[PDB]
RNA sequence: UCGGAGUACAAAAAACCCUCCGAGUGAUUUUAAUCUAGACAAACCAGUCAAAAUAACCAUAACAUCACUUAUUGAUCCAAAAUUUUGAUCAACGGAACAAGUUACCCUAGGGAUAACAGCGCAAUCCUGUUCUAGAGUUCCUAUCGACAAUAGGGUUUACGACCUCGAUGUUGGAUCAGGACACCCAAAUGGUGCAACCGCUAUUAAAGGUUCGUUUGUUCAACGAUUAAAGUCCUACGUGAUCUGAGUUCAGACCGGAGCAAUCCAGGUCGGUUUCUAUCUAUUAUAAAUUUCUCCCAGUACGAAAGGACAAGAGAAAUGGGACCAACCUCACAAACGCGUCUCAGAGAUAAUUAAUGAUUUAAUCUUAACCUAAUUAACUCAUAAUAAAUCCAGCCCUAGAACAGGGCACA
RNA sequence: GUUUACCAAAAACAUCACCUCUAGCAUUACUAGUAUUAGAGGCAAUGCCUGCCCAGUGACACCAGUUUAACGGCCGCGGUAUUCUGACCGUGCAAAGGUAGCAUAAUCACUUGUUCUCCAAAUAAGGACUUGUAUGAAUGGCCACACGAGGGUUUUACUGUCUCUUACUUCCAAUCAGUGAAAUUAACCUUCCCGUGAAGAGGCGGGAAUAAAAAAAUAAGACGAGAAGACCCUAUGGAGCUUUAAUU
RNA sequence: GAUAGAAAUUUUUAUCCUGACGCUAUAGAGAUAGUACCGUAAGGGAAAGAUGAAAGAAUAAAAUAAAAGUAAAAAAAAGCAAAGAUUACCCCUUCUACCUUUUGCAUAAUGGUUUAACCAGAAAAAAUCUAACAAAGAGAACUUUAGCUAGAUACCCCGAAACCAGACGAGCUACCCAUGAGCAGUUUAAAAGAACCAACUCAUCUAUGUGGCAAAAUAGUGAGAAGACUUGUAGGUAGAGGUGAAAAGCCUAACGAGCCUGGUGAUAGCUGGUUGUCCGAGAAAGAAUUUUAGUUCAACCUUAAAAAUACCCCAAAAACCCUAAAUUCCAAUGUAUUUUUAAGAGAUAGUCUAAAAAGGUACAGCUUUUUAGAAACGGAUACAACCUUGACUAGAGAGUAAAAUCUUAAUACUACCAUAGUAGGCCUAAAAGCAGCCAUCAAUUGAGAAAGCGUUAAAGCUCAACAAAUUCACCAACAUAAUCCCAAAAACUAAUAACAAACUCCUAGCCCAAUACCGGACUAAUCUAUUGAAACAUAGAAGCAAUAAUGUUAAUAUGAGUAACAAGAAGCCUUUCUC
């Protein structure tokens, strides 16, 4: 049993890992890249 | 193999049945005395202050040549000792100087004791190394006495204190004694290299 | 060669098993279903004051039926046929 | 044993050899009764509140008060009083009426529920790297280090935990045989030097092969002597006791110093002290295709003011290890075996680190997780090459062939 | 000389010698003995000695008092020696405060104390210093001859102990013929590597390997066989021994 | 306290009617017998029988040829030895032997070679059910405010070290008492607890041996050997003891105190074992306790019976300095659960995960509290605790669930010339942009009294400045272990695919898992009372069921035809040769 605050990143439950993977940030993507657009 | 795990327990969870700071101070005093003897006596060449510590028997006691005589320099390579205050102990002073390991052969002139500076030679350096080893052994004996006193204090406290506590303090004192005797050996080796 | 200290899944150092796209898709589907559920659970047909005692006679009648069913517990009737049918074990042919 | 606060943040409860306060009662007078609803708390025993009604004081209170007021306390039985009460650091505080030490001379029932060895988890401790430069280094952080700090890894030491074994996992050290890792001691290829040369100091790559003999000590270690190309660090149940020893540890005997009145004991010393196994199963029971030192020339050359003084190239000798063999010497009273004696030991490719050629992204340069061919380059490892490599006669008898079975011969004579 | 018959033969016990106590006495020991004797003990011949102490516990004394060759004990504190004194100077407490001797011992640790001889090299052995704050004088202290299957250390001599093993015989061994056990055994159709797993896998997972049977060898594993671990802990389980344990 | 336990006073009519719901050779007496055999003795103590009317029917006749162990008939890659199967024995796919103990065992934790026969739950106070009679019941003595009487339902086996009493043991050994006997040779005025060394007595060291020749030996080597010596015979000392040149030795192969018998079926909170089928429900710990290896209560749970509210529970309500997740109490509502009454046992030695904490090293597969979950025959390759899953049967049907290769492996910045007051002023040997301090102006279209190298100080090399063109430009990259790396491989044919359970539908049903404890229905084999008479039915009884106790007895296998064991030669046959 590890403490709530540790030094080894305290690997999570698999359900929590799946939750974070699902809730990962998704940046918006424009339809056409504007760099060498008009 | 590491083979020796150093322990520094707290000295502060104890504070009362033994004073580790006091023991360390005593061991440091032993080391300082050894270094002071090495510096004062065995530099390269005998000086009037170098033979001021040779004990001379007087009235069934031990007294120093500086205490029972006046030591000065007459010639650049000569030492003059005036035993005017204690003319009786002249022969005892000669015995002290002659069987002193510092290689001083004195000449008896009634009361004006004449000690020439022999030389700085390979033989003289060997005798100085022998004296350094003798003084290191005497300092080791003094350190052993200091450690024995602390062990006696632990024995005095060994009726109500936990056996594990006593064992840990004994191990700590042994570790300090080992460190100090290692320092003594290092100082002796350095002095031997300096002389030779 | 690459040992996992202790057990695979309990210790401080566990197995670094990752999260798959299938697992992400399954969780997303479950989240969509729960969002639909919590939408449907938003607007009630009746209010708290309107539902007050709307079906209470039925609950009282159900409890009374349960009490009657429990109270009807009693040993069964003993009939003469049950006792006299044991003699039939020795019926023979004349 | 009892109470208060935190753990236990908001009904109650809630543990630790968790962190702090306390109690085993004092002072004073208002000397504080009986009976009874209903409740709190609680395994039980115990602990707490309390309306109405009763006799005496204001004819309007009585819950004794204060010291954080919460704790200031003890059951039956049994003993004593004058019949109404009292009596325990029974403090191991739900309390046996009254009872110690030692056992290594020990025994029995169990426990891996619980220790010593090993394994296992962790990495406090230990060991490796990198990040950061204040400082040393004459100036100059990084030639060599590098405090205060950061971060990652290994599981060699001590400790921590008590998960497998107590209807037995037999211990240190040594002998024999070693398998493996590389964090390379030697041998090999290089980079930087505060690298002139010889010695050196660091770092990169490489684990096919090596890594001595002696005095003391049971010793692992350690000191010392003589050498070596070097006398590496570790893992393997601190490898290996159904292969060996028992010097130490750890049984029964006995001295010494001490402790205890004694029995007896000491993380004290010394002498002596039974080390079993007939192998059932798995596993195994021989192909090669070298290494390293030393002597001479280079050469007293390069390099150096001089002292000092190489590398590369070229010749040999020796040792070790692998495989063999008796002409002689030696062991040798069998014709043989044997070492102390004799013979032999190798070509190509391939690479890691690191050097340069050509040349874009980036019309310059740039060895290129840019293509094209490039060359100088460790050890491994493969392959040239070497060995075996003609099937179905086998009774008997010999054999430099063999446990048995097999294998070679039996026509010269 | 004796001892743990069956893991210890010793330095342990006994021993001559020297000391303590207890006894003035008759028909079964002592003893058919009578204090130059007989019992209960200590230490160990011999040589030099055996220092101080009756405060406490014993024993005589039935209270004082006496006894240590009875049980036993034989100082603490402050200062001085550069640190380090056991020596000294004072002080306090005691019944006295360790005398002679020996001494890093078979003597807590420090410790492989220091020095010299022995060796090319020694934590070994011997000599000397020694302060052993825990030596020490019949629970005996020191030396000495002789003795010892006692425990250590040297010198030649000797050798297969060893450098470094070799040859040959006998018993073993292998084959043939006869007779013919034992521990052991859940069933096995009984591989290797890595990982996992009650944390060391032949049996699980992922891979490699894989005609089947004999015979002879080696012991790495089967946490091999043997003995319901003797070490450790528990048991309101035992037993031996000692008492300042409780009842007597 | 555990427990022990009367009396005064009452009842009891002679004899036969007696045999067996007792056993049938591992049973019943130990018994074919207290015999063989084992011990000096007291004492312990067995196993062993099967033909037939006739064996004065053995050129003998019939029933079983059914246990383990073998032979008939050795084996062919691969694997808890089997199952799904299949044309087909293997080849294919799937399953970590069984009890016991544990938080958890394939575990390398215990037990077992196998077969056969024996081997382990026993009591009626209170209670439940059934029945008789009932203010009374009972065939005498008592209980009675529906009770009294009767019947049926219930509580194991093996195992110590030990303790006490009485016998038997000194033929071994310890020591004595009688009676005898031995010591040869050599050196010594010696028979001197002297010396060498035999017989003889001991047993120092080593090597074999270790189920051996031997429950203490063999070989070599050792000590004593005229004495405190060895030894024969016989006697004595006996266990709260004897004896002891103290080793706590020896006292008939085990002595910190002998052995046998009896108490004795000693006692074990400790270990092991505990024998038919199916079904229903089903428990992980709060307090005391010489107590934490155990019990007794409480809380849970089982079996019956009475009832009526039981969980979920919106407001409103629960403290004062600050305080989160959330708690307590409650209508409605969705379900049917809950409370009392009577019997009760097991358990009270726990694991991980998620969360709030504490100790430790903000370490542990670490330890202690509170809340929740789990302990799949699916998935995470293997797996306890993680995830999916309201656990029955048959099907060669179907739909779903969790879940099956995770992310980057990245950092280039190039020409172009740099002159002036002036070596700015001080300090300094020198300080010229540069050990240092202060000012930091000014010439040129444009260049800091100078942002870095360099010189002792200068010099010199760059940066910024102008003039020339001007892709993009801020941080981000980091070694290793020991038997042998570890599925193989794959960057584009359309994917909210498909394949995938004890889940859910489909077709039928006998219509939902389980450890300790609890309840129920059946039932194998015996005996008895009545049926039945090619082997049964209803009742009543128990010596009433064994894959497990290092279980007892007997027989069998493995080890294993293995370890080990033995007879000198020839000959005219018991005569000569070699030791
Ligand atoms: N003092 C006291 N002793 C009691 C009590 N109950 C029993 N006892 C016993 O009675 C005895 C009294 O003996 P005492 O101590 O007076 O000589 C002891 O054994 C004691 O334990 C009590 O309540 N008080
Ligand atoms: N005390 C207790 N033990 C249990 C419980 N459930 C199972 N056990 C014990 O656990 C063991 C069996 O494990 P299971 O089969 O339940 O996994 C048995 O020793 C059994 O007695 C329970 O609820 N409480
Ligand atoms: Mg936790
Ligand atoms: Mg693991
Ligand atoms: Mg883990
Ligand atoms: Mg209540
Ligand atoms: Mg009132
Ligand atoms: Mg108590
Ligand atoms: Mg208590
Ligand atoms: Mg209480
Ligand atoms: Mg002893
Ligand atoms: Mg035992
Ligand atoms: Mg436990
Ligand atoms: Mg250890
Ligand atoms: Mg081990
Ligand atoms: Mg351990
Ligand atoms: Mg192990
Ligand atoms: Mg740790
Ligand atoms: Mg780590
Ligand atoms: Mg500097
Ligand atoms: Mg290890
Ligand atoms: Mg354990
Ligand atoms: Mg635990
Ligand atoms: Mg064990
Ligand atoms: Mg076993
Ligand atoms: Mg090797
Ligand atoms: Mg490397
Ligand atoms: Mg090198
Ligand atoms: Mg190597
Ligand atoms: Mg280790
Ligand atoms: Mg080992
Ligand atoms: Mg072994
Ligand atoms: Mg060993
Ligand atoms: Mg052996
Ligand atoms: Mg030994
Ligand atoms: Mg010894
Ligand atoms: Mg001996
Ligand atoms: Mg074999
Ligand atoms: Mg063998
Ligand atoms: Mg050369
Ligand atoms: Mg050779
Ligand atoms: Mg170019
Ligand atoms: Mg270039
Ligand atoms: Mg080839
Ligand atoms: Mg042939
Ligand atoms: Mg003798
Ligand atoms: Mg005797
Ligand atoms: Mg004897
Ligand atoms: Mg013996
Ligand atoms: Mg002897
Ligand atoms: Mg012996
Ligand atoms: Mg003696
Ligand atoms: Mg005398
Ligand atoms: Mg004595
Ligand atoms: Mg004497
Ligand atoms: Mg005296
Ligand atoms: Mg006295
Ligand atoms: Mg007196
Ligand atoms: Mg004493
Ligand atoms: Mg002083
Ligand atoms: Mg002396
Ligand atoms: Mg000592
Ligand atoms: Mg030696
Ligand atoms: Mg000393
Ligand atoms: Mg003394
Ligand atoms: Mg003494
Ligand atoms: Mg005395
Ligand atoms: Mg001798
Ligand atoms: Mg002797
Ligand atoms: Mg030879
Ligand atoms: Mg057996
Ligand atoms: Mg096989
Ligand atoms: Mg493994
Ligand atoms: Mg597999
Ligand atoms: Mg496999
Ligand atoms: Mg593979
Ligand atoms: Mg083996
Ligand atoms: Mg196995
Ligand atoms: Mg083993
Ligand atoms: Mg074993
Ligand atoms: Mg046991
Ligand atoms: Mg043992
Ligand atoms: Mg013991
Ligand atoms: Mg107890
Ligand atoms: Mg008893
Ligand atoms: Mg007493
Ligand atoms: Mg009582
Ligand atoms: Mg019978
Ligand atoms: Mg058969
Ligand atoms: Mg198969
Ligand atoms: Mg498992
Ligand atoms: Mg259990
Ligand atoms: Mg366990
Ligand atoms: Mg295991
Ligand atoms: Mg296990
Ligand atoms: Mg066990
Ligand atoms: Mg097993
Ligand atoms: Mg079992
Ligand atoms: Mg077994
Ligand atoms: Mg009844
Ligand atoms: Mg008794
Ligand atoms: Mg007799
Ligand atoms: Mg006799
Ligand atoms: Mg004679
Ligand atoms: Mg003699
Ligand atoms: Mg012999
Ligand atoms: Mg011999
Ligand atoms: Mg002899
Ligand atoms: Mg002799
Ligand atoms: Mg003699
Ligand atoms: Mg007794
Ligand atoms: Mg006796
Ligand atoms: Mg003794
Ligand atoms: Mg003894
Ligand atoms: Mg006996
Ligand atoms: Mg019993
Ligand atoms: Mg218990
Ligand atoms: Mg069920
Ligand atoms: Mg209960
Ligand atoms: Mg509310
Ligand atoms: Mg409600
Ligand atoms: Mg318990
Ligand atoms: Mg835990
Ligand atoms: Mg829970
Ligand atoms: Mg459960
Ligand atoms: Mg599976
Ligand atoms: Mg389910
Ligand atoms: Mg300008
Ligand atoms: Mg510029
Ligand atoms: Mg590296
Ligand atoms: Mg499906
Ligand atoms: Mg279903
Ligand atoms: Mg029946
Ligand atoms: Mg039965
Ligand atoms: Mg059976
Ligand atoms: Mg056995
Ligand atoms: Mg059995
Ligand atoms: Mg056989
Ligand atoms: Mg044979
Ligand atoms: Mg065999
Ligand atoms: Mg044989
Ligand atoms: Mg013969």
List all residues 6 or more positions away from C14 whose beta carbon is below 8 Å from its beta carbon: A11, C4, C8
Say if residue C13 carries a ligand binding annotation: yes
Residue of chain C with shortest Cα separation from A24: C24
CA B27 to the chain's CA centroid: 13
Residue carrying the six token digits 């190394």: B129
Helix (H) or strand (E) holding B132: helix B122-157
Indicate the pairing of strand B112-116 with strand B78-82.
antiparallel
Q: Which of B130, B128, B105, B109 is CA-nearest to residue B118?
A: B105
Cα C37 to the center of its chain, rounded Å: 21
How many H-runs (helices) and E-runs (strands) does chain B carry?
Answer: 5, 5
Overall size of chain B counted in residues: 196
Q: Which two tokens stand for residue B109?
A: 């002139």
Strand partners for B56: B63
The method of structure determination was cryo-EM
Residue closest to B100 by CA, chosen among B130, B68, B140, B138: B130
Query: How far apart are alpha carbons B50 and B38 in whole angstroms?
Result: 10
Chain C positions touching A8 (Cβ under 8 A) are 12-13
Q: Which residues of A touch C18 (CB under 8 A)?
A: 17
Quick count: other Cβ atoms within 10 Å of Cβ B40?
13
Give B192's contacts (C-beta < 8 A, 6+ positions apart).
B129, B132, B133
- Joined together, the tokens standing for residue B91 give 């022969």
Task: Show residues of chain C in contact with A18, CB under 8 Å.
Answer: 19, 23-24, 27
Q: Where are the beta strands (DSSP E) in chain B?
A: 55-57, 62-64, 70-72, 78-82, 112-116
Of residues B190, B196, B149, the one with CA closest to residue B39: B190
Q: Give me the phi and psi of B80, to 5 degrees please.
A: -110, 125
A36 labeled binding residue: yes
Burial (Cβ within 10 Å: 0-12, 13-18, ≥19) of residue B96: buried
| DSSP H or E run through B144 | helix B122-157
H-helix or E-strand containing B80?
A: strand B78-82
Cα B2 to averaged position of ligand 27 atoms, centre (Å): 24
The one-character DSSP state at B173 is H
**Ligand 138 centre and the CA of B132: distance in Å?**
85
Q: How far apart are CA B17 and CA B117, in angstroms?
A: 52
Tell me how far apart the alpha carbons of residues B119 and B173 are, in angstroms, rounded to a whole number. 44
Sequence-distant (6+) residues with CB within 8 A of B7 are B168, B171, B172, B175
Determine the Cα–Cα distance for residues A36 and B143; give it in Å rounded to an integer. Answer: 86
C-alpha torsion sign, points B18, B21, B23, B24: positive
* Cβ <8 Å between A22 and C12: no
Largest Cα span, chain B: 66
Q: Which of residues 6-65 of C touch strand F (CB under 7 A)?
A: 6-12, 16-23, 25-27, 29-30, 48, 51-56, 58-60, 62-63
Alpha-helix residue ranges (DSSP H) falling in C11-79: 21-40, 57-71
Is the C-beta atom of C12 closer than 7 angstroms to strand D? yes
Rg over CA atoms, chain B: 22
The C-alpha atoms of residue B155 and residue B134 are separated, in whole angstroms, by 31
Q: How many CB atoms lie within 10 A of CB C48?
A: 7
- Long-range pairs of B3-8 with CB within 8 A, sequence gap ≥ 24: B6/B175, B7/B168, B7/B171, B7/B172, B7/B175, B8/B172
């Amino acid at each position: 049993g590890s403490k709530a605050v540790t030094r080894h990143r305290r690997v999570m439950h698999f359900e929590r890992q799946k939750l974070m993977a699902v809730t990962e940030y998704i940046p918006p993507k424009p339809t056409i890249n504007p760099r060498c657009l008009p | 193999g590491q083979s020796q795990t150093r322990v520094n327990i707290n000295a502060a969870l104890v504070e009362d049945i033994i004073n580790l700071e006091e023991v360390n101070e005593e061991m440091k005093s032993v080391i300082e005395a050894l270094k002071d003897n090495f510096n004062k006596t065995l530099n390269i060449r005998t000086s009037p202050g170098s033979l001021d510590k040779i004990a001379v028997v007087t009235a069934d006691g031990k007294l120093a040549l500086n205490q029972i005589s006046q030591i000065s320099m007459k010639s650049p390579q000569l030492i003059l000792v005036n035993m005017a205050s204690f003319p009786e102990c002249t022969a005892a002073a000669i015995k002290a100087i002659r069987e002193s390991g510092m290689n001083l052969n004195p000449e008896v002139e009634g009361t004006l004791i004449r000690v020439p500076i022999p030389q700085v030679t390979r033989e003289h350096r060997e005798m100085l190394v022998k004296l350094a080893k003798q003084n290191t052994n005497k300092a080791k004996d003094s350190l052993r006495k200091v450690r024995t006193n602390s062990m006696n204090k632990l024995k005095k406290s060994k009726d109500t204190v936990s056996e594990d506590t006593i064992r840990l303090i004994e191990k700590q004192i042994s570790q300090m004694a080992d460190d100090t005797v290692a320092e003594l050996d290092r100082h002796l080796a350095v002095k031997t290299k300096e002389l030779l | 060669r690459n040992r996992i200290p202790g057990r695979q899944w309990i210790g401080k150092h566990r197995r670094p098993r990752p999260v798959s796209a299938q697992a992400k898709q399954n969780m997303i589907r479950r989240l969509e279903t729960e969002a639909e559920n919590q939408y449907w659970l938003s607007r009630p047909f009746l209010t708290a004051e309107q539902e007050r005692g709307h079906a209470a006679v039925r609950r009282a009648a159900a409890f009374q039926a349960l009490k009657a069913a429990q109270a009807a517990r009693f040993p069964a009737h003993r009939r003469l046929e049950e006792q006299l049918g044991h003699l039939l074990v020795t019926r023979k042919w004349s």
